[PDB]
């Protein structure tokens, strides 16, 4: 995944300020609230009946932690997103049957959460850098679909 040195530094600098568990819980919950069709994967999580129930669901938060931790790990391999996520890609296709459009929706919801979390520090050039990275991650997760 090709970024400029500036762009990479801006991505990593902000990510050092992220509470991953919190932000992962936030991002997955907002995905399920804003685009409720994504709930189809998570019927075993329990109550998703209202936004507060989703946002407060322990299973949702736990998945959100799992997902963003792997994202986090990925940020250390920006030069090789495809390789880093190859096995995760095969699993989401062959076993989990997840439409890769969902990865793009989550990327956009994550960008919103970062903006909400960091306010003015989330500048237009910092957002641009994050948009390249979430597209890069979505593409890498979709790469082994067949």
């Amino acid at each position: 995944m090709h970024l400029t040195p500036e762009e990479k530094s801006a991505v990593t600098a902000l990510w050092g300020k992220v509470n991953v568990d919190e932000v992962g819980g936030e991002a997955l919950g907002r995905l399920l609230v804003v685009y409720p069709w994504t709930q189809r994967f998570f019927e075993s999580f329990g109550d998703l009946s209202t936004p507060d129930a989703v946002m407060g669901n322990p299973k949702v938060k736990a998945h959100g932690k799992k997902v963003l931790g792997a994202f986090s790990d990925g940020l250390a391999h920006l030069d090789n997103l495809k390789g880093t996520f190859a096995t995760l890609s095969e699993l989401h296709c062959d076993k989990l049957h997840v439409d890769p459009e969902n990865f793009r929706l989550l990327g956009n919801v994550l960008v919103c959460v970062l903006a909400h979390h960091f306010g003015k520090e989330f500048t237009p050039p910092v957002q641009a850098a994050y948009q390249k990275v979430v597209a890069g991650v979505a593409n890498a997760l979709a790469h082994k679909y067949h």
């Binding site: 804003v34 936004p51 957002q127």
Partner: protein, 282 residues
């Protein structure tokens, strides 16, 4: 599209935006140009340098139009009637760009309204911007009498093959766009599969029903609307892929009938069907 609670959240969120609408509008456009550089192709006549008076003025016009839209949320198509005309006949912006601007407007709102940007208000805002985008692109090309004539003529010729063509459309889609196979993990998708045949026929029959009720499509497909929104929960992007593969199937079977005019009418018809089937998703 918007429930009354949705309308409540947007008015509450936008009021708080208030006198900052102009600067927020300019920020949203600046974020878009930077994050989605292909959108710059519609502004080669602008100085897009940061803080440019052209960008600031454009942002303020766009924010005002949104304020007008918020003020008349219950009658948006009439309130934005002029702006609809302008984008459809003069500016002619590809519809995909509206989603990109909407996303940057959401990012902007998020960065400036920490207290207000709750999950529910986020959802409402995303819906509202999608509805605005729909109104602004609504006159680009709903079905005129000539279209309805072309569809019935074309589908009539399909006739008793409607089933077999439906199976072919699905097969073409699974091969050409393999991501659509994720919604069918419980099928044999091999060529000739009787599961695919039966599904294709049901889908074809449903389309025959839509053609027959072309003037009353929301009611005739209402049950199927419910099914896709609340059980199957198919991402809306996939409907455009099936529509394309239906077009290819018809083209391959109707050499005489698939004229440019009939092609255009079929594409409009399948987009309307797709709109109806995703109408209850949120």
């Amino acid at each position: 599209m918007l429930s009354p609670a949705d309308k409540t959240n947007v008015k509450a969120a936008w009021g708080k935006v208030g006198a900052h609408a102009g600067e927020y509008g300019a920020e949203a456009w600046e974020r878009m140009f930077l994050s989605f550089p292909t959108t710059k192709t519609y502004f080669p006549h602008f100085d897009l340098s940061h803080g440019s008076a052209q960008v600031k003025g454009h942002g303020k016009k766009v924010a005002d139009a949104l304020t007008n839209a918020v003020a008349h949320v219950d009658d948006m198509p009439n309130a934005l009637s002029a702006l609809s005309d302008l984008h459809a006949h003069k500016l002619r912006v590809d519809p995909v760009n509206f989603k990109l601007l909407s996303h940057c407007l959401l990012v902007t709102l998020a960065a400036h309204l920490p207290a207000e940007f709750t999950p529910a208000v986020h959802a409402s805002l995303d819906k509202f911007l999608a509805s605005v985008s729909t109104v602004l692109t609504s006159k680009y090309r709903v079905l005129s009498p000539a279209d309805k004539t072309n569809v019935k003529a074309a589908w009539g010729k399909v006739g008793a093959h409607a089933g077999e063509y439906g199976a072919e459309a699905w097969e073409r889609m699974f091969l050409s766009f393999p991501t659509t196979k994720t919604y069918f993990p419980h099928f044999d998708l091999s060529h000739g599969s009787a599961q695919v045949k039966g599904h294709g026929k049901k889908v074809a029959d449903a389309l025959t029903n839509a053609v027959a009720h072309v003037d009353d499509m929301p009611n005739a497909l209402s049950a199927l609307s419910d099914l896709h929104a609340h059980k199957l929960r198919v991402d809306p992007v996939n409907f455009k892929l099936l529509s394309h593969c239906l077009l290819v199937t018809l083209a391959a079977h109707l050499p005489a009938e698939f004229t440019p005019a009939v092609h255009a009418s079929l594409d409009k018809f399948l987009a309307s069907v797709s709109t109806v089937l995703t109408s209850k998703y949120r």
